[PDB]
A = this chain, B = another copy of it.
C-alpha cells in the first residue's frame, strides 16, 4: 500500500454544506 496522504478537504469530517431551508409549520387548531 502506498504511503498515506490526508485529503485536501482537511480530513476532519465529511464536507457538510449549508443548504436552503424552510420555516416549519404548525397545524390550524381550528381545522
Contact residues of A with B, CB < 8 Å?
Answer: 20, 22-23
- The interface residues of chain A, by DSSP majority, are classed as loop
Residue of B with least CB distance to A24 = B22
CB-defined contacts of A22 to chain B, threshold 8 Å: 22-23
Residue of B with least CB distance to A19 = B25
**What is the CB-to-nearest-CB distance from A4 to chain B, in angstroms, rounded to a whole number?**
25
B20 close to A20 (CB less than 8 A): no
Residue of B with least CB distance to A20 = B23
* A22 to B23 CA separation, bound complex (whole angstroms): 8
**What is the CB-to-nearest-CB distance from A29 to chain B, in angstroms, rounded to a whole number?**
16
**What is the CB-to-nearest-CB distance from A22 to chain B, in angstroms, rounded to a whole number?**
3
